[PDB]
Structure formats: C-alpha cells, structure tokens
Amino acid sequence: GAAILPDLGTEILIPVCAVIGIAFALFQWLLVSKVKLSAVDHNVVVKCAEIQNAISEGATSFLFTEYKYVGIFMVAFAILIFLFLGSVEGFSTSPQACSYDKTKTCKPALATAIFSTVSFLLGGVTSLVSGFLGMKIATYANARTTLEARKGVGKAFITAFRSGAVMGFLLAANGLLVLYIAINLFKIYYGDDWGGLFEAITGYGLGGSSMALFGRVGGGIYTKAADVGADLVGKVERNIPEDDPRNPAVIADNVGDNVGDIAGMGSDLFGSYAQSSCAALVVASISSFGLNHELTAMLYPLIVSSVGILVCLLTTLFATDFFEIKAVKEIEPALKKQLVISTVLMTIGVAVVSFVALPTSFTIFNFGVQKDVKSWQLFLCVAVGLWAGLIIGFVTEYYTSNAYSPVQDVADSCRTGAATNVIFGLALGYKSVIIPIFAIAISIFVSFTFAAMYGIAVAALGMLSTIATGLAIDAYGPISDNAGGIAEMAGMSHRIRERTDALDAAGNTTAAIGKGFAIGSAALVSLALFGAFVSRASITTVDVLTPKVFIGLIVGAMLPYWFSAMTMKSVGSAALKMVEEVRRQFNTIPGLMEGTAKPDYATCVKISTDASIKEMIPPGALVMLTPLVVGILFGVETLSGVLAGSLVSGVQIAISASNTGGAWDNAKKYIEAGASEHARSLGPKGSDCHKAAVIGDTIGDPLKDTSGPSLNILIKLMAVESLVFAPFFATHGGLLFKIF
Amino acid sequence: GAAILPDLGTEILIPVCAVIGIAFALFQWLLVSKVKLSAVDHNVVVKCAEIQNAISEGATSFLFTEYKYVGIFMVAFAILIFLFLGSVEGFSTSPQACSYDKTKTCKPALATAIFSTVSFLLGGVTSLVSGFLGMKIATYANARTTLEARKGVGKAFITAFRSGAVMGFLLAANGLLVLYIAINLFKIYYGDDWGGLFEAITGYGLGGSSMALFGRVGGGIYTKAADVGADLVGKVERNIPEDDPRNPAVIADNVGDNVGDIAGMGSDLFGSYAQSSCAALVVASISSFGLNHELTAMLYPLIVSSVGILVCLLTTLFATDFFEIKAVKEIEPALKKQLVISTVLMTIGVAVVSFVALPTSFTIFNFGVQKDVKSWQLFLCVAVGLWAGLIIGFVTEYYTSNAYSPVQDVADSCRTGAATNVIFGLALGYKSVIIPIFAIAISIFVSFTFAAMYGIAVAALGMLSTIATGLAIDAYGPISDNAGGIAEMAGMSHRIRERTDALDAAGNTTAAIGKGFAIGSAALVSLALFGAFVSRASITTVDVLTPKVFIGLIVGAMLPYWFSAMTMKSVGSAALKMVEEVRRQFNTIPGLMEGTAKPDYATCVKISTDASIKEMIPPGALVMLTPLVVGILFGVETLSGVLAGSLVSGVQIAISASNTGGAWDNAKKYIEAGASEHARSLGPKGSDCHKAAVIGDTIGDPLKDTSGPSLNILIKLMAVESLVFAPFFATHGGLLFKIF
Ligand SMILES: [K+]
Ligand SMILES: [K+]
Ligand SMILES: [Mg+2]
Ligand SMILES: [Mg+2]
Ligand SMILES: [Mg+2]
Ligand SMILES: [Mg+2]
Ligand SMILES: [Mg+2]
Ligand SMILES: [Mg+2]
Ligand SMILES: [Mg+2]
Ligand SMILES: [Mg+2]
Ligand SMILES: [Mg+2]
Ligand SMILES: [Mg+2]
C-alpha cells in the first residue's frame, strides 16, 4: 500500500532537508566568524591567535598522519570485501536466484561484491570527512570562545554551542545526503532488485565504523598520553596550574581534545548513524516496502532523519537566540533542555512521518515469515528508542555532574586520599549501568515485539534521530575545554579561567551523555544486525545450549576486556613516557620553571604521535579480524555466539568506564571551582584532596577517552562486518568442523 | 550394565576415603601442636600467644554474629523452598507417574519438596562448619608459624602448609561424607525412584552456596574495611610499619584474614564442591546409571572425589616431608609443584576410576534423548576440567607473582605515581582473562560434545577433584599473612618479618589461583545447571533471538556490575570510617605514636562488624531474589537469558578484579622486599613509589577480597536456585505475560 506522501515528495524532501541543515551549519559558522582575532585587548588577542595556530597545526598534522595509515588500511580491507563476497558464486557474471525469494532472479552476487566495496569506501571517506570537519570548526572556535569569555559566560557559551551545532548539523546532513545519493546511484544498476541494492548499501555503515575504530583509538591514545603526563607532573608534582604554558605537554593535551574527543567522536557517531539507517534499510528491503517497490515507506529512516534536522534546528534556537545564560548554574540545565526539547518536538515529528510516509498496514520480514505490522506500532518502535535515549541522558547526568550527590560523594572521599576516591569512582560507574541497561531492555522488548529486527533498527535510529543536537551539546565540550587551556596559555585574568571551567565541567557531563547515546544505539543496532546476519547466513536457530554457540558467547564476552587491556596498557605506557619527558624539561631546561625559558612542545607531541599510530593497530586488528577468523574457522553458529556475548558484555564495561571517568573529572572540577562551602572545604587547588581527585581524574582519562567509548564501536563494527560477510562465511566458513 | 567395581565396594570405598582424609587432617593438626606457646625471649613466646588470643577471640566472635544472622536467613529460605515446591501439585500426598518412565510410579512432588528443604539445610550447615573449622585451624596455626619463622622460612612454610592442609582435608572429606550419608538416607525413602532422590539432593549445593554468599561478602567487607584503614593511615600518612601494634586497626585487619580469606573462602569452595557433585548426580539420575539403578556408576563423581583425597594426601607429602625449602625463591615453585603433582597423579587416578567404575557404554540424558556415551569420553570430560584448572593456575601465577614481568612492570609504573600504577594494574587484570576464558571454552566444547550437561558437570568436578590440595595451598596464605602480622605486633626482629613477607607474597599468588579455580568451576557447573534447568522447566529451545530471552541476557550480564557497585561502595564507605577512627586515635591519644600508650582496637573491630553485618544483606538479596523475581514475573525463558548473561559476563569481571588486586598486592611486596636492584631502586619503604604501590594495593583490596571472589558465588548460586525452583516457575511463573 502506498503512503500519503508520494515517492517524488520523498525524493525532494530528503536532500532539501539536508541542504537546509548544511545551510544552517554554514550560517552558524558565519556568526562565529563575527568574533575577530589575528596573530598580527590586542596583546592578548594576538597571543590567543598564536596559541590557536599552534593547536590547529598540531591537530591537522596528526589527522593527516593518522588518516594516511587508516586510508591505506581502508583500501586494503576493501579488496578483502570484493574478494570474499565475489567468491560466493565464483565471480560468476550470471544472475542467480534471489537469496530472499528463490522463485525470482537477482543481479549477480559479484555485482553486489562490487557495490559493497564502493559503499564501504563511501562510508570510510564520509567518516574521515566527519571527524576532519569537526576538527576544523573546533580548532576555529576554541580561541573565539576564550575571547568571548571576557564578556561573561553566556557570550562564551553561545560561541561554543553555535560551533558545536556547526559540527552537529554538518555531520548529520552530510551523512544523510551521501546515503541518499548512493541509494539513488545504486538503484540505477539494481532496478527492481532492492534486496541486492540495500545489501550493497550496508557497506556504508561498515565503512563508517571501520575508519572510526582507528580514529577513536588512535585519537584517544594521542590525547590521553598527553593529558595524564601534563596533569601529573604539572599539578601533582610541580604545583603549577593546569594548562600552564611552562608545561611541555600542554600543547599535545589541547591538540588531543580535537583529534580524539572531537575527530574520533565525530566519526564514531557517523558510524552509529550510518549503521542504524542501513540496518533498517536492509530489513525493509525484503519486507513489503521493498518487495512492492514503495520508495517512500522504504526510505522511512531517511525521512525520520530529515525531520530530525529541522526539529534540531528549531531546538538549537532556544539556546542560541531565545535564552541567555547569566549564572554558571544555568549551563547544564540549558544543555539538558536541548535534549528534552528535541525529544518532545521529535516525538511529534516521528508521529507525522509515521502518519504520512507509511501505509497503515504492511509486512515486516521476520526470520523467513512476513509479519503483519501497523504504522502506529512502528511509531512506537522509533519512540522507545528516542525516549530511552532521553532517560539515558538523565541518568548519565545524575552520575557525572557535580550538581548531584554521587559525584559530590566521590569528591568528598578525597579527604581520605586517592585510594578511596578511586574505590568510590569505580563503584559509581558500576552502579551507573543499572538504569541504562533497563532502558535498553525495554526498547528491545517493545521494538522486537512489534516489528522484529526492523523495529529494533528503527529504535536505534530513533535514539539517534536527534543526532545534530546530540552532537552539538557534545562537541560544545572539547571546544570549551580548549578555550580554558588557551586562556591559561595566554596568561589571562582568573575570571576568564573560571568561566571556561564552568563551561568545561558541563561539557564533561555532556560527553558522558554522548557516550550513553552511542552505547545505547550500538546495543540496539547490533542486535538488529545480529538478527539480519542470522537470516542471511541461513541459520535456523541460534540455540544457546549448543557447544558451538556457547563457546562463541563466552569468548565474545571476553573480547571487550581484551580490547580494554590493550588500550589501557597503551595509554599507561605512553603517559609514563610523557611524565618522564615533562620531568626532564623541568629538571634540565634552565629558567623553564622560572618562566624565562620556552619548553619544547614538539617533543611531547611526538611521544603521543608515535604511541597512537603504533598502538591503534592491534586493537583495530582484534575487532576486524575476529569476525573473519571465527567465521572462517568456526562457522556462523559460533560467530552468532560471539556477537551476542560481546554485545551484552561490552555494553556493561563501556558504560561503567565512561561514567567512572566522567565522575572523577567532575569531582576534580568541583574542588577546583570552590563554588560551595563543601567544595571549598576540599580545596584549595594543591591540597591533598585536590591531588587525590587529580589522581582519580587521570586514571579515568583512558577509561572514558580511549577504551570506554571505543567499545561501542567494537560491538557495532563486528555486527555489521558479520552481516556483510555472511554469504561468504555460510559458504566457505566453518573450516575446522569440515576438516574434523 | 554393572561396572568392575560392585555397588557394595563403592559403598565402602567412599566413606573409607573420607575417614582417611579426616585422619590425615587430624594427624597434621597433631604435628602442628608440637609448636608450643602460652600466655601465662620467653616474653616473645608470651607476646605471640596474647596477640593470637586477641585474634582468635575476634574471629570467633564475628563468625558467631555473622552465622547467627545467616542461620536465621537459612531457616526462612528453607521454608520458602518447602512452600514453593509443595505448591506445584497443591501439596498433594498422591504418587504420580515418573516423568522419566510413564510405566512407573514415583514418590509425590511433596516428598521432594520436603527432602529438598532437608538437603538445603544440610548444605547450609555444612558450609558453616567448613568456614568455622577453617577459621579454627588458621587461628591455631598463625602464631605457631610465627615462632617457627625463628628457625627459617622452611620451618614456617611447613607449619603454615601443614595447617592449610588441615583445612583442605577436613573440608573435602566432610563435604564428601555428608553428601554420601544424605544420599543413603534419602534412598531409604525414595527406593527405586532415583530421579526424585537426586532432584532432592540438589538442595545440598543450594544450601552450601546460599550460606557461602553471605560468609564471603560479610567476611569480605569486615576484613577490607580494616585493611584499607590500617594501611592508608599507618603506611601512607603516619609512616609506620605495616601491622604496627600502635595502629588501632591492626587487630581487625588480622582477624579479617581468618573471617574473610579463610572462613568465607572455605564456605565458597564447599559450595563449588557441593554444586558440581550435585549437578553431575541429577543428570546421571535420569540417564542410564540412574534408570538402571547402577550405584557404582551413579556415584561416579563421589568416587572421583574419594580418589582425589588420596591423591592429594600423597601430593601433600612432597611439600611436607620429601622437600625442604631453604631459600625464599623456592616457596612459589613448591606451591606450584603441589598443583602439578596432584594433577598428574589425579589424571592417573581418574583413568583408573573411569576404568573400574563405569561400563564401557551407557547413555546420558541429552535434552529428552538418551545420548550414547563411552567411558573413555567421560574420562576426557573430567580430565579436561582437571587440566583447564592447571592452565588457569599457571596463567594466574604469571599475572600475580612478582617473579614475572607483568607485576614487576606494575611496580615499576609506581615511579610515575599512583595513577600509572592503577592504570597498569587495571590493564593487567583485563589482559589476564584471555587464557582462562579460552581454557574454559575448550573444556565446555570437549565435555559438552561428549556428554552434554553431565560431561560439563563432571568437568567442573574434574577441576575440583584435587580440592584438598587446592584448599591447602590457598589456606596456607592467610595463615602466613597473620604470621607476619603477629611478628610485627610482637616486636620481633626484622629477619622474622622478612621470612613471613616471603611466605605471604606466595600466598597472594596462591589466593589468586584459588580464585581462578572457583571461577573456572563456577562457569562449568553453572552451564551444566543452566541446561538441567531448561529441561526441568520444559523449555523446548533457549533461542537467543526472542524478546524474552534477549532481555534476560542483557539484564543478566548487568547483574555482576550491580553487585560490584554495592560491595565496592560498602568497603569504600566503611574504610572511610575506619580511616577517620585511626586518625582520631593517632591525633588525640597521648603516647600512642610514641608507643607508651596502647590504642583502642575494639572500636575498629566494631566499625568492621557493624558495616559487614549490615551491608552483606543487599548484595545477598540481589543474588537470591533475582531468580524468584524473574521466574515469577517474566518466566523461565527470560530467566534462561539471565543465567547465560550473568555467566558469560560475570566471569570476566571476577577474573580481572581478582588478578588486578593480586598484582597490586605483590607489586607492593616486591618494593617492600628489595630483593633485586630494580626492587631496591623503587624503595625503600616510605618512598613515593612504595606509597604509590600501597594506594594500588588498597584499591585492589575490595576488588580481590570482596567483590571479585563473591562473583563466582553470584553466578553459580543463581544457577542452582533456578534449577531447584524450576518446577515452580514453569507452572506458576511468567505472570506479566499471563496478565497481559
Ligand atoms: K570534555
Ligand atoms: K593473601
Ligand atoms: Mg587533564
Ligand atoms: Mg581535554
Ligand atoms: Mg583540558
Ligand atoms: Mg573534562
Ligand atoms: Mg581528562
Ligand atoms: Mg593490607
Ligand atoms: Mg590480610
Ligand atoms: Mg596482612
Ligand atoms: Mg596479600
Ligand atoms: Mg590487602
């Protein structure tokens, strides 16, 4: 059944909304350019601009180096996709029976091996463009946020948030436009074979998350080596302020906010967006929508994202035009309003899209059977994902903001030293998982029940339907974080650093919230892909109580720990070398501590550049080799176990790591600000409580910026990778069981 | 068909072997009594006796308090068991057709409800005896180990190890003999109805682990609050030795080792022994052994345990007589040789047992079907668990002993502060899970394939066939811990503490190893019980990709994190109180720091007692209520997911926590001993490195002694509980799906 909105309306609506989001982001970049500064007050403006240039050059330099390796890996792995998928029907040029309906004839499997390779490289390139653009705006707006901090918090907040929105709307409108364009290009070849079209398209998400795994790990290693080294020697050993220009690791630290927290994060979320859209597409592909070639209903996920951009645009105005921040206590509530407003507005949006872009009745593929589904049931699938996200944001704020007891109790535990600070921090993180898991389970139950794997996929997209806003609040953070580091390197007034610090602490909470959305959506989308994988691999039942599935389940559950071991050990080893370097400079360069001599920044940049590029590779290998190794040697049943186990296991450590690290940071920020008497009782900066907080903060650095947030990528990447290679695994895999 | 070993022989062999183990234990306790002391230098002998009595009194006191609460919970829960099980057939007294053979009449379900309650209480009481006896031997051997340290490590080693063996053989022979007696007593009633005989018997393990959960958590909180408090204030703050008699928290610290590391541990391992034997028995009971009433083969697991006692007796003689330690580097290898010899001897013993106690062919129940199994396949089932254990032992040694690079690098990482020490230690723990998980997976695959759930249960039992020795080397540790604690409190020479420190470091590794075995066997027995549950609940297929199962899976996987949040927070909070109290005495009691005034030990004992008796309740409730809540509300399918999820997810956190904490401890011991240039450069005691090590160690305290080791109980306890209540859930559960 056709919908109210005709195919031509949809063909127009989607890219119109994208260009709108692009226009809007370009516009926000313009308003941010209204803040003038050059390296030619005035003496302070010149210094800020010199510091920005140092950071901007350091950031661009690292991404270029990083993307070189990753681009090469991108090219190599694309050959593997062509070869393995092409080998399914021996590289035949002949058409064959449809995988989904043996009464019909489909395009040759080799064409699909080729179009998978193309969309993969599309996804890889879009992923790199995402993180790179985000870096460009972030390294542009940081000093602009510092300069506007001379006029109050509100003025600096806007600059930071407008700039976060630039990244938000650019990433979200570009990822949509490319997908839409790819789908229409692909359709030219595939014609009536939508099954093959969208099976090819799923390479897009595989491309996105592949180039994101390396950018999150590599970026995260770079940034945390510097962070730990700068803060330990600077603040704990030498009693100098954070981000002090004497500290040789400060440039690498602040560069690191852009190459990890911004660039890697942008790629990470692009992967999430792309996989969730593609997952929905691949199931609709072989449900009534794709079989009846109903284009509008087929592109329902892209229509939801389209409305999401408009909703997020109106939402953004509330924090950019309609309201101003007068007290620092208004920052976190302002950012949270963004989530609440977008969630409420988008519920209405999805209601409308569900009403105009869907027939009231259709069928959804359900493990070999066309299942009857109503459009109001699909509305609820998108909606549970959307609201689960908001719930996750709220619980995450509660456990990571210093406006509430959990983080204040952690700061408070500093009176008895670093050991109690850490025990309390760990326990907080563990505790934090409870509600998010419950929210995820409710989303799974509701959406699985109504619409099977498609429902779960659109629940994932629901949670990410507000991604422009989500990215905006998140990106706002590292921009504020740089703004404070620049203020201190520029030797500005203490009132400036206090303002940026308030903006920064809100960004800490905000970045934890972003991790929650990433982990929540990854859980949902991976589950949906898992289901699609099982179908595509022609498995009758994934029975937990079979030797093959169970070994996969327990081994898959171990993988997130293995991955965490590597990345933790890497940061630890790199930070250890950074500390030794910072100490060397302080102890051998005369006048450095005195303020007479310049530190050698480039040496610290090198330590974390060398460590990141080298050490990003094994965890990257572990994630990408696991589907291939298990699928080839052990078979699709065992890989099924690996996927379920790594999902339910990886999710727990991801959440606890991110929240623990976030809480330790904000506990530290609490002490540093001294905005209440309790906070003031743990101070001043330099006290034993403050230093204990800093210890916990630096332990949490790799937890929340390297291992923790990369875990969502590990889970969803393996899931999509498994689906893509399912025909190959089902045919040529299971080797060890065929031999013995 | 009958085995070579006739039923009457088996009836004799088993108790004879239990009596041999009990006689051996008594003999060792006798030889240990040859070390004389009394409280009535010669002052050194007197001071040791007074300190020992203060520790004995404290430990006997706490367990009485703890066991009183637990014994009351036990009685209540036993009523719950009777009521819920009896309600399945409305408490009818009428016999019904046997589920395993409709041509036969079985005893009423009501009788099984009664005998299940009886076996539950038996297991609970035996668990309590196990922990209490262990505490009584440990608190008898501690000061005798101190006095013998005057003659050297070798002498001290012998008394500590002889004593650990007292516990090991008493616990193994007692667990065995009680189970043998219960089976014969229940048989008087059940007659030919072996299915019901052994279904009732499974409450034994349920009682064993129910009580162990509280003994582990309660004792664990008690000891760790003291430990962290004593260590932080005394060592990091006040710069005094560890276990210094001036420190008010030292008595509670050392009582703690007996109350947690001994009594808790003893109950814990008893539950493992009981569940594995019971898991094997239920499956055999409705296989050919039970269907054909072949006693010898039915009691195969008990015969294996009978032989293990004898094997371990021999093995013990190698560390007790045939070899003398004369140098500190020989302690760990002696300890490791215990595992090696027992494993090799038991491989032979298990071969002999498999040859004389089984018919060459038989059938094992396999989800409704009788699976043809051969006796050499069964030999391999128990042998693969036996050998997986040793691998776990070797790998765990490699990660927790300061003789190897992992821990030495952790210690080395102290050179850059507490933050790096914590990052390295966490990474070490994560890294450590890999081989054990693979070892468990291999064991599952082999034993699952050959003999389904019975094979799996029998592999778990295999892993614990050498439990007398396993307990011996383990119990050796806390005894050695107290010995150095007593030596310091007694003001004995530096040389004595040096010998005890060498004994105690080996104990840290040995404690990690015991944890490895408990987690390994927990995974195995839980999976077997999971499978039995599924049949008992008449579940046709546990399909991962159904809404009901998957939500159980993701929620199940979260439970171990919820549990770790609670226990970590408890210790953190009680430790924070302990620190405040210790600081108060040092700061306000004139003459304390000077050693002319005595501290108030009792107040610290009271803080540990109050926190542990209170805060053991919620995590205990989380474990025991979960099957009931899920089974009653959501039904057996969902509970299935929960059983799988908590298994695969819980083992990862249990392994990484135990090993990280172990590594932090021995990294500290390495610095404290200065037995090489590298270790010395990190010292001396009181250096910034040492204090960084102490910070790591104290964070590790609750990880490895409260949360970590209790996790194996969480996993395995929910598994027996689900099986025991399975008929009740299958019939009266799943309400939320019945209402709607
Ligand atoms: K941040
Ligand atoms: K120990
Ligand atoms: Mg920092
Ligand atoms: Mg930063
Ligand atoms: Mg910063
Ligand atoms: Mg921060
Ligand atoms: Mg940081
Ligand atoms: Mg201690
Ligand atoms: Mg101790
Ligand atoms: Mg001790
Ligand atoms: Mg120890
Ligand atoms: Mg300790």
UniProtKB/Swiss-Prot annotation, chains A, B:
Membrane topology: Multi-pass membrane protein
Cytoplasmic side: 138-160, 223-260, 321-328, 400-421, 480-508, 577-605, 664-706
Site (Important for proton transport): R216, D261, D268, Q275, D705, K716
Alphabetized UniProt keyword annotations: Disulfide bond, Hydrogen ion transport, Ion transport, Magnesium, Membrane, Metal-binding, Translocase, Transmembrane, Transmembrane helix, Transport, Vacuole
Enzyme class, first EC level, given as a word: translocase
Record's comment describing the protein's domains: Has 16 transmembrane helices and a large cytoplasmic domain that contains the active site.
Family: Belongs to the H(+)-translocating pyrophosphatase (TC 3.A.10) family. K(+)-stimulated subfamily.
Assembly and binders: Homodimer.
Name of the protein in question: Pyrophosphate-energized vacuolar membrane proton pump
Classification lineage: Eukaryota, Viridiplantae, Streptophyta, Embryophyta, Tracheophyta
